[PDB]
Amino acid sequence: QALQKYSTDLTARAREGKLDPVIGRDNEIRRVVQVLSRRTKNNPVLIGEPGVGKTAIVEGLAQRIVAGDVPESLRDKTIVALDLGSMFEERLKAVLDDIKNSAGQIITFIDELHTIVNMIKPMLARGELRLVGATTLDEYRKHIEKDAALERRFQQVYVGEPSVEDTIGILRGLKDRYEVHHGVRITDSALVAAATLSDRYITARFLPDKAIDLVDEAASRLRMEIDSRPKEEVGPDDIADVVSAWTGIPAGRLLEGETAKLLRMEDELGKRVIGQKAAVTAVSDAVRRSRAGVSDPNRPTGAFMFLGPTGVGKTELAKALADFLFDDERAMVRIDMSEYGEKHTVARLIGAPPGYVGYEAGGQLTEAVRRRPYTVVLFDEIEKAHPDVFDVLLQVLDEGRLTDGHGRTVDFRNTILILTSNLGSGGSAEQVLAAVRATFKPEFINRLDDVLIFEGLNPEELVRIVDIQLAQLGKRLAQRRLQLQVSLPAKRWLAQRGFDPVYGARPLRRLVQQAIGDQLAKMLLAGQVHDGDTVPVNVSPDADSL
Amino acid sequence: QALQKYSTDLTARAREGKLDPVIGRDNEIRRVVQVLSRRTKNNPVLIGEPGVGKTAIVEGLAQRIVAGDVPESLRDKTIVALDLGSMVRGEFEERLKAVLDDIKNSAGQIITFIDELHTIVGNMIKPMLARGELRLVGATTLDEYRKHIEKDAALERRFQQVYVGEPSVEDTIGILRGLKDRYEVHHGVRITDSALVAAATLSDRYITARFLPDKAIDLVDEAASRLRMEIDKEEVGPDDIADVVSAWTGIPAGRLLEGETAKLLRMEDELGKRVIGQKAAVTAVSDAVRRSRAGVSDPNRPTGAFMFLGPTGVGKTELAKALADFLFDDERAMVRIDMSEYGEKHTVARLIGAPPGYVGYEAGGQLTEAVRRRPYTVVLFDEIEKAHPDVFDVLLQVLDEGRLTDGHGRTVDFRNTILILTSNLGSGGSAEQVLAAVRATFKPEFINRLDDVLIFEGLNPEELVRIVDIQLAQLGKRLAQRRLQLQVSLPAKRWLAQRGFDPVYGARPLRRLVQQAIGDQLAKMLLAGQVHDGDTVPVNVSPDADSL
Amino acid sequence: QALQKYSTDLTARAREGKLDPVIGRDNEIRRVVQVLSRRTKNNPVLIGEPGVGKTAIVEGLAQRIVAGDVPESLRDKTIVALDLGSMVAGSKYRGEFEERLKAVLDDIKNSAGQIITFIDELHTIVGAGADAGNMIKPMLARGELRLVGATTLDEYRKHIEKDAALERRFQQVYVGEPSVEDTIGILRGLKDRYEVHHGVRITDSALVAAATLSDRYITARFLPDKAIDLVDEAASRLRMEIDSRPKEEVGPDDIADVVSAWTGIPAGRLLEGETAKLLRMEDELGKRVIGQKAAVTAVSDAVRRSRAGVSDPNRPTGAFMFLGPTGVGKTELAKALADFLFDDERAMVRIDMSEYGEKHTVARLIGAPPGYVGYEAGGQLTEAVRRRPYTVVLFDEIEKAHPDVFDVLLQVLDEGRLTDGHGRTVDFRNTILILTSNLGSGGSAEQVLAAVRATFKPEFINRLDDVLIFEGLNPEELVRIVDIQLAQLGKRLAQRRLQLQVSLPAKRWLAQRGFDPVYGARPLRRLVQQAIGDQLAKMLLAGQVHDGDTVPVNVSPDADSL
């Protein structure tokens, strides 16, 4: 009776009727009471993530106890809690004396007992206090997993997060508490919008609490825009607005200007990547079948690998892909699989486990994808890595998460995966087909999307490349204001001279440099071509004079 | 008695009987009390898997003590337990000093007991131990003990191992039927020997993660608690436990019954639910697998060594994928190893990997390292005709004695696997020259040890509708995220046949050919509009191609 | 009060008589004394493989000091048993172990030079750092403390010789293991302690037999304790047999009982029943091999000699190579032998020499040198033989491996020696090597005894024992062969309750078809299968046959039928 202050009550609140809204999970409450009425491995704990409603689980348990659906050994059982805000070791003895001397009738519920585990171990060894708790999977696995002394008295009970149809009524039961501060109307449309939008896209928090914070920030945004400079009720708009401002991944109804660009991706990308019709069709069909919600929910929103002959665009295409989605090139995650020539370099992209020298440094991939999980990762020269990182990527595909040294889990269900190589480089189709089937096991290539092949450059395809390179050189030497004047004969001359179909486009850059920049840099330092000038070029018998 | 707050007693509470009697395992107690009665290398250590009865044996010895039956040397000597999860950076050695000093000044032979001491061992107990005043009785698991007590120990010269592997079905049944009344008063429902034996056998067979003496008690107590809660049937029975096992694993209560008759009679269209046509082949293979597990064939032979060849794209692999699915409860079990690279004399060592210290050693062989683990697979062999006439010697050794040797030195076992040697021979002959070519190309005596050599019959120009129909029934699940139903029309569905067969690789493309077309041709409607989740999406056969 | 809670008094312990009476080893005690009595750098360190008594010498020195048998400047020195496990243990702060170590050193150097110190297993002296076990190094090289130590060879080399400037202040006393006679002396000295502990008696013949067996069968540990452990084990077993059970002393065969109760070796003095089985061997082995009377006698005589006590203790128990026509029963004779003296057909180590046609494939039964891929795994054969040191090695058809693998057996034989990757050695001294072949193939004994000579070498044929030649299958005895096969089949038909009623003409046609002169009885098991097992399988799953029916067979004009 001397515990009423250091610990609150759930028997008085039961009768006095005030209780947070509880719905569903009745099978879970039945499981809880069934495992409580056992002889061994009784008094379970709750496993999950922030935003399940496990306090709500035990609250519904208490409400059903006070209503009465219990077995014979549960005469209301007066379940209680032990306040962690009750924080020396002398008081705890008398605090636990009431629980011990009880008949197991004032059993307690230690909310978040993860870190409490000296004192309560022998006090539990006799089987007198239930010590029911509520923790998460990471804390179970790092705290109470290896100790065989306590895993004989704890039978975990897993819980299911997404419950959209009941989150509707949950919002119904909590909508009132937010219509008082925010003088706003969150319509049923807003309820079922918060319920059915942020689940697949904002998978960084969890539905029952991310949906509460979504409507909270939406009501705050509405009460904000109410003033002089920004609607009178939350609808299907401010919800999507808050969806956009979280973790960077855009997800709404439609931005009313993005539907056009997406229809025009193939054409828009053809001005930076040239040729590869099959490749552009396949890489375009891959993102449109995702932005619309057609793609599968447990998979990276894009994952394939291509290869072929050199100098064709295997990197330029991925770089243009990073360009057209983030508007800048630096927003791509790029790690080159060339340096991974030994086995033990797995911890370079994973981070060393607790207890070694480089411990707080974190990985190079998982740390860059944990925060801002929408960028595109480029695995340049995947063929070079030790055939053990391929086993990590095996887990990555078709599962969508990986663990690093510290024991946390990050998600990969909204990113794009690009891998490249040049296997064979001389086989037309069957040699390279058998080679890619033989170098990576058929159980890893099974999961992938289409493995693409680039075809190579041709004469008609090189004049446009020359035009692109010349426009680029203009952009470069525009800051000394020496805009170019080049003739179509010289254009075709370059496009013809640099053509050899074994190296691709790199000889064209080499020829452009050695042919123009040579003479241009020779003149620009001897004077007479000073700033604000336009130089012409003309095909000389062998060279091209200026 | 000064710091007895991290220590529990075993004889005091034995003077009350709050322990469980441990009938059975009376050899181990005699072995332990014999070891503990020596002069050097005393204080044994119990080595065995988890939840095997390690704590049960020491408690049984404690109870035999409190009764009094051992030699009077060990008589009148108590035991004290310890919990290490209460001690644990630092001050663990300080409390270790406290407890060791307590034991030391106790000035007697008060035996200790330290569970899973592989976390304790270090150099702080050996000067205490090589003097003869304390007696510690520890316990751990086999591989763990091999880790912490062999490399950094140098102490193994003063520890004696004791082995407790696992009880058997008949023994855990006696254990259960001994430990029944306690629960018949805890809950109190009723108990049946049928339920006990069913729990024992079903746990042993299907709960392949935990072990017997605690695994059985767990299931029994769970079923009893569920049937006490159900009163929200005053007995537990075999079904009353099979339901729990089904809820646990996922496999329903039906298949969790007799596994010979009701299984070998399911060799029916349950295969034909995944394969289409080829009922003759399915019947032949079913008879071969039925008669093979009868119990009269030699105990050293693959469970089947048949092969099937002919036209591709007819579902040659699909038969095997469905076969492994039905038998081993998984279709991700077959392992395909192409006989293409094996066209060179030297490369036959690729599927084994001969020497330790050469290029391919750690990777093992392609065949063995994928068989010694998961010895339930269904190995496939593409284009068996192109493999050099030296791997056939390996195959002979396989299907003449159910074992093989890798390079590491291990022995892989083949007495419960299934071989399947696909091919592509027989391009011109119907049934007359295909067998002659198979006889002439391969060694005509190697084929003798094989089973039926059936050839897959071609697909009826009508019987492509069934395969494409299973395909459509499948792809109907694809757009279940927006509940957009699909249309069917015999002109459209049969339009897939004559334009997707391409009779050099059967229906290889018949998945992509239709999926890309329909999916990516409707994928723009799925963003613009024109459909909602009740629309048949009527697709028609336009004058030339398949528009909507 | 400094070295009062971090140390005991070994001298006072010996004064209280609670130590064991060291016997012998006066050379090493004299060396330790004439080192400990030096002027500067007086610190001996007892070095030697583990188990040979590296501490016993220190207890001996303590006893000698207590008794007063030491030179003038060594009386009343009270050697101290220092320890560091209880100094570095409780300390979680900056500079706290240093205050304790300095207090101990100060308490030593305040008193006169009469606190001779003793740290056991001093390979635990280089740690404690984080400048520890290193401040203690000026005092060492000045003769302030004496610091008698004791460390194993391996730990010494691994932990100290990496710290050369510290190893200089030490002196090594190589404590080699004793021989059998000294071991008998020590055992006879210690007999009374165990005779008092266990209320039994121990015979001198038992002590001698222990000291002799513990040297010939347990070749992984060392003598002065490897022997004592057996005496203790047998005393304890006899005690347990006396108690708890409603001619009370250990004997010289209980020790053999122990040393056979582990390691599997049947070493003993032919207890009863065993002799009956050995005398009844040629016939008992005949029930599984019919014919070859010449060979069974040889192997039987080998086993008889080896277990009767007349055989060279350092050479294998036999190295037979028998060869002959195809399908005569060579591998089957070997398997029947292994089944005889083990009753476990899968407890022998057969290796198929048909695989080693390549040169480099020998590495599987040796290992790999240090610095290569598979090194810590070992060798297959060596690993299989290091445990179970009683198997029956076999070499299936050793004619394929090209003549280089013949240069490992060349010294496996005649010594029972083999050295794997790690540099270890294993003993084949109590195995039966057996290697078949197929030279000849029809030729007479003087046309195959030329094949052996022209294939192998003199250095090889000289190693192995008699080269048994196998006769051809007598056309008569195949009836008994078919009898054996039908018995094995009936044994396979035991989960059900079926029997057979095999008729004499059926058995005759069976022995008549499937014994072609070039391949012997090999095409008989497959014929039995395809003519009985499959016929019954088609006849059991489809009714018309049920368990219990004494199924008869017939001799129908066509292939055999029911």
Ligand SMILES: Nc1ncnc2c1ncn2[C@@H]1O[C@H](COP(=O)(O)OP(=O)(O)OP(O)(O)=S)[C@@H](O)[C@H]1O
């Ligand atoms: N289709 C193309 N469109 C635009 N630029 C291209 C194209 N093909 C090649 N290039 C240019 O040629 C060079 C090749 O770029 P990359 O894509 O990095 O080379 P690659 O095709 O990936 O071959 P490797 O294996 O990486 S050397 C770059 O300077 C590109 O700008």
Ligand SMILES: Nc1ncnc2c1ncn2[C@@H]1O[C@H](COP(=O)(O)OP(=O)(O)OP(O)(O)=S)[C@@H](O)[C@H]1O
């Ligand atoms: N022979 C036996 N007699 C009575 N009870 C037994 C017997 N064997 C097992 N048990 C019971 O089965 C349970 C086994 O659990 P433990 O004793 O913890 O197992 P263990 O041998 O300590 O190995 P771990 O640590 O559990 S993997 C005990 O609670 C016993 O009551």
Ligand SMILES: Nc1ncnc2c1ncn2[C@@H]1O[C@H](COP(=O)(O)OP(=O)(O)OP(O)(O)=S)[C@@H](O)[C@H]1O
């Ligand atoms: N000369 C001896 N006289 C009497 N007993 C001996 C003698 N040599 C060895 N022993 C006994 O043989 C055993 C050897 O044990 P120890 O010498 O203490 O072990 P150790 O020599 O320190 O080897 P390590 O490195 O500690 S495992 C003890 O039981 C000794 O009593």
Ligand SMILES: Nc1ncnc2c1ncn2[C@@H]1O[C@H](COP(=O)(O)OP(=O)(O)OP(O)(O)=S)[C@@H](O)[C@H]1O
């Ligand atoms: N005297 C015999 N007693 C029993 N079985 C025999 C006898 N002679 C031959 N056999 C049988 O003949 C068959 C072949 O015997 P194996 O010894 O295995 O052949 P093999 O001696 O190894 O000949 P190769 O050269 O290796 S093919 C087995 O089924 C034996 O049971």
Ligand SMILES: Nc1ncnc2c1ncn2[C@@H]1O[C@H](COP(=O)(O)OP(=O)(O)O)[C@@H](O)[C@H]1O
């Ligand atoms: N099913 C539900 N319906 C309505 N409100 C709920 C429900 N579950 C929880 N709540 C309320 O929302 C909050 C959720 O937070 P909390 O339960 O602490 O999350 P967690 O379970 O991760 O600890 C609680 O304070 C509770 O009052």
Ligand SMILES: Nc1ncnc2c1ncn2[C@@H]1O[C@H](COP(=O)(O)OP(=O)(O)O)[C@@H](O)[C@H]1O
């Ligand atoms: N009899 C069949 N039953 C079901 N699907 C079949 C059948 N024959 C072919 N298929 C289809 O063809 C696809 C590929 O055929 P597959 O067997 O992989 O090619 P191959 O026979 O050349 O190895 C299967 O995934 C399946 O969709």
